[PDB]
């Protein structure tokens, strides 16, 4: 949920999880880090990415940049999305995973 | 000159304060105010510049001069502290 | 703090190196830390002028001041790190993007929005150690006391991103003028994937890059640091193929000269020298000690340029030799060049009488191999290299030069002379940052060159449609190139064929006299010159032959220009250009280190390096021109290295105490070879001062002597008005009190001769001498910041005086001269580093007419190195003695005493500025009815336009 | 002091006036202004500024009178005019070239004499030593320099190191009989000292790296105590030398065979110096010379290998 | 690619396929993804020691070994084999 209501912050929340996002995005393209492991760093961005944009959508209230058309494609550069799974995005290493693949 | 004044705060809320709490507010003093926001060198002679300037004649008169018979910061690039800047 | 007197752990480049490995390796190491100790100075310095200061209530930094050369970062962030490439352990990209507020000072704005791709910039973060509501800094104490560096990462610039986020690649700048909104900008940035890999092979939950908060950019001169290492890295690990004539004396083995035409198998005997002779007389000057003689068939009377010479000396056959009872012979043959015009063109020509050490030089620089010549001040330097480049592009057409040099300065200079000659316009090509801003009236950057190609092939289709209309051909045959193209060669060539025809088998004894005046097919084309034909079937059909390669030149023109509409992008379009229609290519040695990794890439080939200012190139510098192209074979193609400097003069700048002078970087490869001995030519006259003048510095070269002009001249015989002598060393007693004066680690300053220099040059002023031909002059930099403020008082605040030429150090006057030179030498308890003799030639070459030296004597008098030159200032009073009766210019000559009056000897700084005040008094009334007439016919003659 | 006694004998501003030569000043000069305040680079500096070598030392040189005081001060003003680096150092031999061949030579031996020298003077000899090694453009000192490194230094090799040799390279082995039929008798008188120098310098840099091992740099029983620093100079300034020696193909060609047999390297990376604190800038010297010491090249070829190359003649090496 | 292994252009096959696989789209069009063109290239480089010369055919092998954890002993004995068939069997023993 919205931790703050003031515009300012919800830019600044919505820049702290894409900072957040990108150390695990890290995380998950090392190999030495175990199927459980990765796939529930897997779970953590996809919710990061989930939540940037619910973020994205209090700024669009609270009068703000609207960021979805300003949303480059480079996100969905290392996340594809499977036909079945409309809205989950796999990176890294987990491409690699049998089945997955 | 212009019956105006400028005043810059140390932060935007003093200002943001005292902008709502004074903007088309009566005040003694001015009635209502109306508010918006927005050395020479030892021994040198300078040389007098002519008034309103701002080639050589092919003859010249020579002035009868005859020679004569701690030091301080005077110019930027003597000081240390705006050498540095 | 290194003195010379111990060891380090440091690499030398002492003359000679094991291997090529070798050689690049001790470059790679002693390039990678001076570069690494010109960032600290450069981020020290710009960290101090931000002011950063900890916030009174929060836990970040805020900076409180301003710098040209970095911004405070509004945001970063990692956009993609691409998977290793096949064989790579490092990420392919790492892009960053950097957000900045640019600020609203517009020539800063420009700046920033010129960055481009391979520009080098680096991501900072920094805090203070000391807590004040806004803090001075002292460079008198450690940078590491007062602020903390916690973070620095390079970056590549990529290029700005637009209001979507595409990339403004460098091409779109010249036409996407459309101004971004706000003041905000993006970057995208490329950083290291070695260090991203370094960064992460600890582990992170904590990152490095989320904590950046200025970006800082480096100056157009120290950009190319890391393509400079980037290149020597790929050098160590590929093959490298130095030429096998090129490589032993790059590692200074074998014979020195084992590079030199005299003993390499490949040099040609036989040399068109197109223009470089203005007359048979000339030639026979030019080789003295040789028997010149016209071959068979030709008279003295008619010998006329052009020459080709043969140089019997250079076959390799036993029949042919120096055989006794003869000189060494040299056979002149003149070339009768059958015009390509009937047009009146009179060709561009070389106008320049060189000396016989210049033609030296100049039959040097087109024989293959390698050519050094040493160019002492005013000795012709320039026109020698343009004569190489000129004489090269008619003997070889095919083949392409790359010029190389240290200064976009020189490199102007250049240009500005080859337009001069015969060189075509569209095969000139200019390269640099400085391209957006090129002084010459013609624009011969990339961009600038296309749109010349754009222009004239518009004008010559314009020639293809006149061309149809005299032959009454209809159809759209002017429309394109192609379709000219085809025109030419069923139409045109057909008609053509068919007048040679009639001449050939019919005109020669069987038809009418003057009938070509009749068959002749393009009189329609030539309309606007008259009598094109006189009536003679002779002498008709030689100016047929020329009317016709006026046409065969247009369709040749268009044919190259055919693929300007096939490339119809900004940058494909130069990519054709850079590589194919470019004959002369000329890059500053900095630019030519960053565009390599390009160069390579587009296959762009040259064959004759020619560089200028090569003792001022770093020897890391040098090399690198050789390798921008790629060896098709196991040997590279480069046929000609010239390098042209002056040993004798600075070195480059290394700033670095022990990389200076352990390491020996302030070595050039110009001046290493020189000290290995490899054959160099000396030119040995000089036309550019006064022998006076000349004779301060002449004595540090073998032969070096002057031009007869020289002698001649009425600049050179006339006196410096107001003076009794041309040139003077002038004794500076102390001012105040104190001789020099030192307010910082080695940044010296004397203000009694900042004061004497400014009473000096308002005496000059006063006498009519025009600001722009004198500059001030001082060895240390410390003394040329107090020489600016005290003119920037004392002068530029008064519009009679004005402000000297410029005020510079001698360093970077090196290259530079002027009419009269005020030089101030600083020091006053011990001799300076002008003990460096390098430091002494240039700063004693920089004066044409007058050089006024104000210094300690008893400093400099006592000195061995200088010994040559002060035995000359003792041949004249220690004191400033002046004529003040002699308005500029006087018909005085420059050795006699003058007649009106008598002279005042200046005794001191005190008594100078006393004097200049009375004199500029006195005169007042009479210098400013001058000017306010100067200023009135100024403004009532641009009235009317 | 040195501007008063430079003004009356030498300085060229009285040469009119300056007094006749008296070559007992010249020890006077060494022992009070250079030896005594160990080598002060004031005094030195304004000694050097004074030409007292271009206008007093070297003139006036003759070798049946150069006393140890006149031929050190010598090397000290020619430290002097290469720590300056801008200058052409070897300017007053060039002119008066006669004596320098007995100037160089008493300064080698002065290099291998133990008694008598100081440290500090001992590192000023290996300094000039360096000095004469790095220039070798100059051909008045390349000549002397060439001699010390030339193929006769084979003779310190072993029988079985000198073998190695003459089957990597056949035509060697026919060039060192034409040397030993020579050597043994044709100018041996000298030829023995130049091609036994660089044998005994080496032999004289390990008793300076011994005498620092802590059970041999105890005090005297006599009551002098020696300073580390000089020592530890002399050694940094020793590998700056081998490095020099090794990084230039016409030496290192004879002298990396002597470099390894000798075992140097063995010497230095065991010495206790290498351990210490103070020796860590001898340490990073010791680590440059290793590097040299087994650089990719084949000296007596001068071509250079691929590291395909040496790690495939690594791989054979090892195997048999 | 077809056409240069036909050719026994082998190293500019190799180089080719090289380029293919640091493409990164999931599949290429004649239906093979980037693990398997790169198979195929472990498969070239490995079975053809003598005819490869622009690949340093060890370090793509291990750049095998890190990453594709489910196939390490294969490829430990692909880059042995690699050694086997260059008859370089010293180097054979130390993979």
Same mark, same amino acid.
């Given at each position: ?101 | ?85 | ?6 060891? *380090? ?8 190196? *094991? ?10 190491? *002693? ?118 560096? *916690? ?795 | ?320 | ?72 002993? /294969? ?13 370089? /069997? ?6």
């Amino acid at each position: 949920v919205k931790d703050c209501r003031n515009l300012s912050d919800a830019e600044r929340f919505r820049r702290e999880i894409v900072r957040d996002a990108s150390k695990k995005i890290t995380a998950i393209q090392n190999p030495g880090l175990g199927e459980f492991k990765l796939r529930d760093l897997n779970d953590e961005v996809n919710r990061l990415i989930k939540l940037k944009h619910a973020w994205e959508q209090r700024i669009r209230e609270l009068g703000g940049t609207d960021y979805r058309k300003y949303a480059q494609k480079e996100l969905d550069a290392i996340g594809r999305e499977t036909g079945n799974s409309r809205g989950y995005k796999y990176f890294g290493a987990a491409k690699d995973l049998p089945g997955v693949r | 000159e212009k019956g105006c004044a400028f005043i810059e705060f140390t932060t935007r809320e003093a200002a943001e304060r005292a902008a709502e709490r004074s903007f088309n507010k009566t005040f003694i003093k001015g009635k209502r105010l109306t508010i918006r926001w927005g050395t020479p060198v030892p021994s040198v002679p300078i040389l007098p510049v002519p008034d309103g300037l701002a080639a050589a004649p092919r003859s010249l008169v020579v002035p009868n001069v005859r020679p004569v018979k701690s030091s301080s910061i005077y110019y930027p690039s003597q000081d240390p502290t705006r050498l540095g800047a | 703090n290194y003195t010379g007197d111990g060891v *380090l752990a440091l690499d030398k480049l002492n003359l000679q190196f *094991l291997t090529l490995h070798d050689y690049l390796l001790r470059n790679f190491n *002693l390039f990678q830390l001076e570069s690494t100790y010109e960032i600290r100075q450069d981020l020290e310095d710009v960290l101090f002028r931000m002011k950063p200061f900890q916030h009174e209530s929060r836990n970040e930094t805020v900076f409180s001041g301003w710098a040209r050369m970095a911004l405070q970062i509004d945001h970063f962030q990692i956009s993609e790190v691409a998977k290793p490439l096949v064989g790579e352990k490092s990420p392919a990209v790492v892009r960053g993007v950097v957000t900045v507020n640019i600020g609203r000072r517009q020539d800063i704005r420009q700046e920033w929005e010129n960055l481009r791709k391979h520009d080098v910039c680096f991501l900072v973060a920094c805090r203070s150690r000391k807590s004040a509501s806004g803090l001075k800094f002292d460079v008198r104490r450690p940078f590491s006391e007062q602020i903390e560096v *916690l973070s620095v990462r390079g970056c590549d610039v990529e290029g700005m991103l637009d209001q979507d986020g595409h990339l403004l690649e460098e091409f779109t700048a010249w036409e996407k003028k459309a101004k971004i909104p706000g003041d905000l900008r993006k970057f995208r940035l490329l950083l290291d994937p070695n260090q991203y890999r370094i960064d992460m092979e600890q582990g992170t939950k904590d990152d490095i890059y989320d904590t950046f908060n200025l970006i800082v950019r480096r100056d157009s001169k120290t950009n190319n640091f890391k393509a400079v290492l980037q290149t020597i890295r790929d050098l160590l690990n590929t093959e490298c193929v130095v030429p096998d004539w090129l490589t032993d004396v790059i590692l200074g083995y074998g014979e020195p000269d084992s590079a030199h035409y005299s003993k390499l198998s490949s040099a040609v005997p036989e040399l068109d020298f197109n223009d470089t002779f203005l007359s048979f007389a000339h030639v026979k000057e030019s080789f003295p000690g040789y028997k010149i003689e016209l071959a068979d068939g030709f008279d003295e009377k008619e010998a006329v340029p052009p020459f080709k010479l043969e140089f019997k000396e250079l076959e390799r056959r036993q029949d042919v030799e120096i055989k006794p009872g003869e000189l060494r012979t040299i056979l002149v043959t003149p070339l009768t060049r059958k015009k390509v015009t009937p047009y009146s063109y009179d060709p561009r020509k070389n106008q320049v009488k060189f000396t016989p050490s210049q033609v030296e030089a100049i039959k040097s620089g087109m024989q293959p191999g390698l050519t050094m010549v040493v160019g002492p001040p005013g000795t012709g330097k320039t026109d020698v290299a343009v004569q190489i480049i000129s004489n090269i592009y008619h003997n070889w057409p095919n083949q392409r030069t790359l010029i190389v040099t240290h200064s976009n300065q020189a490199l102007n200079q250049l240009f500005e002379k080859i337009i001069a000659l015969d060189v075509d316009e569209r095969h000139l090509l200019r390269m640099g940052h400085g391209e957006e801003a090129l002084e010459t009236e013609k624009d011969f950057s990339r961009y600038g060159r296309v749109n010349y190609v754009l222009k004239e092939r518009l004008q010559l289709l314009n020639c293809v449609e006149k061309l149809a209309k005299a032959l009454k051909i209809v159809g759209d045959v002017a429309y394109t190139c192609e379709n000219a193209g085809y025109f030419f060669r069923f139409s045109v060539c057909r008609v053509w064929e068919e007048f040679l025809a009639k001449v050939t088998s019919k005109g020669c004894n069987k038809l009418a006299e003057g009938i070509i005046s009749e068959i002749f097919p393009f009189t329609g084309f030539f309309k606007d010159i008259p009598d094109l034909f006189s009536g003679n079937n002779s002498a008709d059909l030689k100016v047929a032959h020329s009317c016709w390669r006026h046409i065969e030149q247009i369709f040749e023109k268009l044919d190259e220009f055919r693929a300007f509409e096939l490339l119809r992008n900004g940058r494909d379009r130069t990519e054709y250009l850079l590589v194919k229609e470019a004959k002369i290519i000329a890059m500053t040695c900095t630019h030519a280190a960053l565009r390599r990794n390009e160069l390579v890439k587009l296959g762009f080939r040259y064959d004759n390096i020619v560089m200028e200012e090569a003792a001022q190139i770093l020897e890391v510098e040098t090399f690198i021109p050789l390798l921008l192209q790629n060896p098709q074979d196991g040997h590279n193609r480069l046929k000609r290295w010239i390098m042209i400097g002056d040993h004798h003069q600075l070195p480059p700048v290394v700033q670095n105490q022990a990389f200076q002078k352990y390491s020996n970087m302030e070595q050039s490869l110009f001046a290493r070879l020189v000290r290995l001995s490899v054959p160099n030519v000396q030119l040995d006259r000089q036309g550019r001062a006064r022998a006076q003048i000349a004779e301060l510095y002449q004595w540090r070269y073998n032969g070096l002597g002057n031009l007869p002009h020289v002698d001649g001249l009425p600049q050179f015989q006339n006196a410096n008005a107001g003076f009794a002598f041309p040139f003077q060393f002038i004794d500076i007693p102390d001012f105040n009190g104190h001789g020099e004066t030192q307010p910082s680690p080695h940044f010296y300053q004397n203000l009694g001769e900042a004061e004497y220099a400014c009473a000096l040059y308002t005496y000059m002023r006063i006498l009519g001498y025009p600001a722009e031909k004198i500059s001030i002059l001082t060895t240390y930099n410390g003394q040329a910041q107090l020489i600016r403020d005290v003119f920037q008082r004392r002068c530029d605040t008064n519009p009679l005086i004005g402000m000297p030429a410029k005020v510079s150090t001698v360093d970077k006057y090196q290259g530079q001269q002027n009419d009269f030179i005020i030089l101030s030498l600083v020091k006053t308890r011990n001799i300076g580093h002008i003990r460096d003799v390098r430091r002494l030639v240039v700063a004693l070459s920089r004066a044409r007419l007058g050089l006024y030296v104000l210094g300690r004597s008893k400093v400099f008098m006592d000195c061995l190195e200088l010994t040559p030159a002060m035995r000359i200032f003792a041949k004249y009073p220690r004191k400033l003695v002046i004529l003040p009766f002699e308005a500029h210019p006087t018909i005085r000559k420059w050795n006699e005493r003058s007649k009106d009056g008598e002279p005042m000897e200046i005794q001191d700084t005190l008594h100078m500025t006393h004097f200049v005040h009375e004199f500029y008094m006195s005169n007042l009334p009479a210098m400013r009815d001058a000017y306010e007439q100067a200023m009135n016919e100024y403004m009532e003659s641009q009235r009317l336009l | 002091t040195i501007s008063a006694v430079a003004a009356k004998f030498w300085a060229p501003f009285t040469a009119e006036t300056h007094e006749n030569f008296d070559a007992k000043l010249i020890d006077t000069i060494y022992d009070n202004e250079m030896l005594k305040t160990s080598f002060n680079s004031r005094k030195i500096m304004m000694l050097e500024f004074s030409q007292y070598l271009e206008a007093y030392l070297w003139p006036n040189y003759v070798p049946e009178k150069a006393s140890k005081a006149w031929n050190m001060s010598i090397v000290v003003m020619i430290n002097e005019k290469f720590r300056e680096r801008n200058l052409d150092s070897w300017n007053c031999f060039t002119k008066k070239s006669e004596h320098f061949p007995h100037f160089f030579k008493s300064i080698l031996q002065l290099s291998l004499q133990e008694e008598g020298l100081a440290s500090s003077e001992h590192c000023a000899l290996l300094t000039f030593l360096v000095n004469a090694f790095g220039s070798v453009e100059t051909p008045i000192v390349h000549k002397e320099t060439r001699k010390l490194v030339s193929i006769e230094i084979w003779a310190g090799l072993l029988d079985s190191q000198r073998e190695d040799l003459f089957k990597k390279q056949k035509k060697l082995k026919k060039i060192w009989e034409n040397v030993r039929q020579k050597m043994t008798a044709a100018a041996a008188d000298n030829n023995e000292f130049e091609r036994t120098y660089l044998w005994n310098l080496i032999e004289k840099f390990k008793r300076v790296l011994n005498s620092l091992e802590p059970n041999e740099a105890q005090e005297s029983e006599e009551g002098e105590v020696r300073d580390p620093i000089d020592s530890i100079k002399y050694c940094e300034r020793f590998i700056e030398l081998l490095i020099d020696l090794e990084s230039i193909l016409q030496t290192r060609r004879f002298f990396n065979s002597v470099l390894h047999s000798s075992h140097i390297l063995t010497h230095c990376l065991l010495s206790s110096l290498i351990s210490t604190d103070a020796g860590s800038l001898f340490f990073q010297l010791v680590q440059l010379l290793k590097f040299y010491a087994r650089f990719e090249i084949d000296d007596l070829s001068g071509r250079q290998l691929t590291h395909k190359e040496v790690s495939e003649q690594h791989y054979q090496s090892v195997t048999r | 690619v077809e056409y240069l292994i036909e050719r026994d252009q082998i190293d500019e096959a190799a180089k080719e396929l090289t380029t293919l696989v640091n493409q990164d789209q999931n599949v290429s069009e004649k239906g093979r993804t980037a693990h398997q063109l790169w198979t195929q290239l472990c498969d070239l480089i490995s079975k053809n020691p003598v005819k490869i010369f622009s690949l340093n055919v060890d370090a793509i092998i291990r750049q095998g070994i890190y990453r594709y954890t489910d196939q390490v002993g /294969f490829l430990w004995c692909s880059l042995a084999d690699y050694y086997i068939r260059s008859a370089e /069997f010293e180097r054979a023993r130390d993979v």
